[PDB]
Amino acid sequence: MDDLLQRVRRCEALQQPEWGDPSRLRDVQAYLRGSPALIRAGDILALRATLARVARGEALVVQCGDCAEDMDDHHAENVARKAAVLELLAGALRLAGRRPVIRVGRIAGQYAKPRSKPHEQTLPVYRGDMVNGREAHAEQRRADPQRILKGYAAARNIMRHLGWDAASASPVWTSHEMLLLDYELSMLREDEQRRVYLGSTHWPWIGERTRQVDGAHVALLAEVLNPVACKVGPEIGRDQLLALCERLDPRREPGRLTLIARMGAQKVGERLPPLVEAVRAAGHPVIWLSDPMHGNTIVAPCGNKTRLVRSIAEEVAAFRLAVSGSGGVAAGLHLETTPDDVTECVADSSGLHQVSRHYTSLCDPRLNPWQALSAVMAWS
Amino acid sequence: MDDLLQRVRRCEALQQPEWGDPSRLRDVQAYLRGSPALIRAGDILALRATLARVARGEALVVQCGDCAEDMDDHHAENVARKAAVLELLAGALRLAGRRPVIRVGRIAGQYAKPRSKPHEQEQTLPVYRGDMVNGREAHAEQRRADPQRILKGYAAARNIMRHLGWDAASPVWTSHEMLLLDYELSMLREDEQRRVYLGSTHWPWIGERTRQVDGAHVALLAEVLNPVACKVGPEIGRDQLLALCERLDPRREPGRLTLIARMGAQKVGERLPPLVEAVRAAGHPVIWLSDPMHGNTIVAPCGNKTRLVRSIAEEVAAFRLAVSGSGGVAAGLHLETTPDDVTECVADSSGLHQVSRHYTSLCDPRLNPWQALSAVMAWS
Ligand SMILES: [Cl-]
Ligand SMILES: [Co+2]
Ligand SMILES: [Co+2]
């Protein structure tokens, strides 16, 4: 509505950029507010019903794409390649998990990243293509809200290429981290019954560092038609998580809430099961996906951070044991990947030396399709 | 039409079963003649145009399924798993080949197999020739040829077509070896312009041992709307192949003819290129697929004949070099596969006694999905 904006704008907002010109933002937000939504409420409903099936344990989920999307990579060929990666993993998971697989993308809006510390020589950290320039500088890192406008345009293109231009396939659903508010608040819409929905993406999640119960991001998604998701990390409280679930799934609707566990290969086995049982006890028909990526980030001797593939697979296996054991629906995988033949991730600790070459990520290390294949295989 | 039947029944017919009861056949053929076709002529035309694209080099093909389809495997779950295998390989090929991939199945009619030796090794029962002809069992009664089986095959095929989505996308096209004339002749149909088509399958091929130019099977497919294909083996003559092409692609239509090279890992490199160049010279816009299975069959001390995965991959690589070198369109792969986690094929010579466990194939050894994955990878 506009009610919702008011409510959300009177909460605390984390990881929000300092936009240079207040006027330009007002202009941008106006333009976005008066533009077509990227997705449709009927499709949202469609997906929502599918995720109800996933909560009943009769279907599985593969979510995959870049850490930080490149918004010159909005062209037919390259999105085709990303969709092919999804084909590959979907088929693999179907065979490993013996259930139907829903394809979901980290695409058409992954243009913002949250930062642990805001601040080379004490410069401002890179925030994504929707916020600031890639190269480390003074002026480039200056936040430019026109980038949001460019991001919208690229996202529209990607949606067209994906097949959400007209009504018809076996669809590729769209998801990205709903961290930003100026963009996202401008993308709110109402349906035929005045029920509000987020119009930027089918299936948004909230990042680990913006999931405060009394916070803005939760408030937004709390009152939104879209199926919602939330990242969950090792050092979250039982009581915390319960409150979070009450706000995002008050009616205990199966398919509504999705919790993506990212707590690392070692910690997951000890941390996850108490959380899962409490949510089961609370009566939330939640669906758990594993995020074995962000739990297991590791610094290589040369090159950036990487992740050992063995570690990722370990976590996937442990995740399923934990969730299934404690009585929850273990429903699939959340991975960051790429079609490009990169070496950003390596099989194991021995391989650490060859990280450097073929490393193209704007942010976190991604899995090459075949590495991701290994990760999905662990599911059994 | 019916004149076609006359013509085709005039020619020489190989690998045709000795049906026990003649009258029952007449009844069966009548019933089939008066039953709905499994596929439709508009879909055929759809596919035909797609294969024109494949002949221009703007798309690729994955054909895969069982050597000998099991008739009681006609249920939603199991065909879902087969389609998932196709998802997996299609995605893989798309990534390796950097072009759009067409999914085609060895399904809904692969119920007959051609045999070199009518009998086998106490008894000496006649060899089992597919679930549409003979019992799997090793006695004398089951091996008795029963034409009711054709009727059962039709029924199972109808079910599979429904589950595949042709009852009313990212379509799974259907193919099988056009072999049982009694069945197949009964499945001939006419469209709105009285153009005849084979109504059992979208995309039929003829096996290497029934591809005689002046033979029955060629004659049938010669005058049929469906896109047609033909297996091509090591010892085929230049002149032979040319004549074959003239009969199956008289008007030089791109997308019409498909030649599936199955020659073996060693022989393919030397034998294929002269054939490919001659057809190029003849001006036939043909599309070549590799069949690295049938060229490379090997006996196992422990079990029934297997295939080394390394050999299969070798042939795939060699196939592409040969075809691309000599100026023809190398357009994809033809593989006998299964979703089941079997050991019917082994990586290489090292796996001596592993073939013991998990060997369920009615006929020739199949690839497990992951082994097939390796085979598709060789395309690179
Ligand atoms: Cl059924
Ligand atoms: Co990331
Ligand atoms: Co075979």
Author numbering:
A (entry chain A): 1 to 119, 124 to 172, 178 to 389
B (entry chain B): 1 to 121, 124 to 170, 178 to 389
Give the article text.
PhzC encodes a putative 3-deoxy-d-arabino-heptulosonate 7-phosphate (DAH7P) synthase (DAH7PS), which catalyses the aldol-like condensation reaction between phosphoenolpyruvate (PEP) and erythrose 4-phosphate (E4P) to form DAH7P as the first committed step of the shikimate pathway, en route to chorismate. Although less than 10% sequence identity exists between the type I and II DAH7PS groupings, all characterised examples of DAH7PSs share a common (β/α)8-barrel fold, a common divalent metal-ion binding site and conservation of almost all of the residues involved with E4P and PEP binding. In comparison, P. aeruginosa expresses two type Iα and two type II DAH7PSs. The type II DAH7PSs are encoded by the ORFs PA1901 (and duplicated as PA4212) and PA2843 (PaeDAH7PSPA1901 and PaeDAH7PSPA2843 respectively).
The crystal structure of PaeDAH7PSPA1901 (phzC) was solved (resolution 2.70 Å, Rfree = 0.280) in complex with the substrate PEP and a Co2+ ion, with attached water molecule, bound at the active site, revealing for the first time the structure of a short-form type II DAH7PS that is involved in secondary (here phenazine) metabolism. PaeDAH7PSPA1901 crystallised in the space group C2221, with two DAH7PS chains present in the asymmetric unit. As with all DAH7PS structures reported to date, PaeDAH7PSPA1901 features a core (β/α)8-barrel fold, with an N-terminal extension to the core catalytic domain consistent with its membership of the type II DAH7PS family. Residues 1–59 form an N-terminal extension to the barrel, providing additional helices α0a, α0b and α0c, with strong structural homology to the equivalent helices in other structurally characterised type II DAH7PSs, in particular PaeDAH7PSPA2843. Residues 167–181 form loop α2β3, which lacks the inserted helices α2a and α2b as observed in both MtuDAH7PS and PaeDAH7PSPA2843. The PEP phosphate group is co-ordinated by atoms Glu217_N, Arg218_NH1, Arg271_NE, Arg271_NH2 and Lys240_NZ whereas the carboxylate group of PEP is co-ordinated by atoms Arg106_NH1 and Lys240_NZ. Unexpectedly, despite the absence of the α2a and α2b helices in PaeDAH7PSPA1901, which are associated with the formation of the minor interface in either PaeDAH7PSPA2843 or MtuDAH7PS, an alternative interaction to deliver a homotetrameric species is observed in PaeDAH7PSPA1901. This alternative minor interface for PaeDAH7PSPA1901 is formed through interaction between chains A and D (or chains B and C) by residues located primarily on loop α3β4 and is distinctive from the minor interface observed for all characterised DAH7PSs (both type I and II). For PaeDAH7PSPA1901, the alternative oligomeric interfaces and subsequent formation of a significantly different quaternary assembly, relative to either PaeDAH7PSPA2843 or MtuDAH7PS, disrupts completely the formation of any aromatic amino acid allosteric binding sites that are comparable with those observed for either PaeDAH7PSPA2843 or MtuDAHPS.
